[PDB]
Ligand binder design. Structure first.
Ligand SMILES: COc1ccc2c(c1OC)C(=O)O[C@@H]2[C@H]1c2c(cc3c(c2OC)OCO3)CCN1C
Ligand SMILES: COc1ccc2c(c1OC)C(=O)O[C@@H]2[C@H]1c2c(cc3c(c2OC)OCO3)CCN1C
Lengths: 148, 148
């Protein structure tokens, strides 16, 4: 079993469009990390995404990744496409999709982080360490937001 | 953020209906575990599910759970409803849903394990330890199945 998807989904008490705009422009200073890179424009000169080389520590180990980020405001979706780095030692493909939708309910939101992956071989782990990291990051972010 | 869902999804090279029937009637002897319990019938005397008290070891720690299992052959869905045990020290609600579907592709299958949870409080973990356990269990099972 080489192709798979891991998901964490969380309910948040926040309008979906508002929350998407917050996620779009905000990424946990206690965790060691920084990036360098560039922004990407669409042709009208407005930034449409970015390409970042990250340096970060995951479960104690220093790592690097190169990620291209795109967004879809119409569907409140952010897509992170990893092309290089430590994760590519385990995965042929590694993409992180973040979606925010109103609860069928109506008022609050459901945020979904999906990691869509293809392992290099059967001996590769599934990216549970990344899922927990992304989960804790969005829980941390959401805990700094309140009504009104 | 108290309500959420964790998912692992895996592609398997097996007809969906065949694979569902295998999952339905098969549960990793190297992991210490046993259950006692009863089967549940629907009214025509045929077994429709079961109610099990499990004793198992998760990440080294002995635990117990009481689980009621139901199935839906029409949708190839198994549902495990945990009512008691160590997990209920962290979660108000804990349900494990296993779905098997044909690939839009056509030939093989996509298996989805979902853990639908509600934490007791903000200090409760999300059930990443259970997700990894269920994942490894279905990978182990699927590795013992081959074509023809
Ligand atoms: C605190 O340090 C970090 C900063 C930012 C991120 C992470 C991180 O700490 C492990 C991370 O995990 O998520 C993001 C980053 C990122 C993504 C995907 C990645 C990745 C990333 O940056 C490290 O590297 C491997 O695949 C998707 C989202 N994007 C914003
Ligand atoms: C090897 O030992 C085990 C046997 C069977 C199971 C597990 C297990 O080892 C942790 C487990 O995890 O999955 C199943 C069990 C089970 C489920 C859900 C549970 C649970 C379970 O039994 C321990 O306890 C907490 O919630 C859903 C599926 N069902 C069949």
């Amino acid at each position: 079993g080489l192709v798979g998807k891991l998901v964490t989904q969380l309910e948040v008490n926040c309008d979906a469009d508002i929350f998407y705009k917050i996620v779009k422009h905000h990424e946990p200073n206690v965790i060691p990390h920084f990036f360098t890179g560039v922004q990407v424009t669409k042709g009208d000169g407005l930034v449409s995404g970015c390409i970042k080389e990250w340096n970060y520590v995951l479960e104690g180990k220093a790592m690097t990744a190169v990620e291209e980020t795109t967004h879809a405001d119409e569907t409140r979706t952010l897509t992170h496409h990893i092309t290089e780095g430590d994760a590519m030692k385990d995965y042929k493909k590694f993409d992180v999709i973040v979606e925010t939708n109103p609860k069928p309910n109506g008022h609050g939101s459901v945020v979904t982080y999906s990691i869509v992956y293809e392992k290099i071989n059967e001996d590769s782990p599934a990216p549970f360490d990344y899922l927990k990291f992304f989960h804790q990051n969005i829980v941390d972010m959401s805990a700094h937001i309140c009504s009104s």
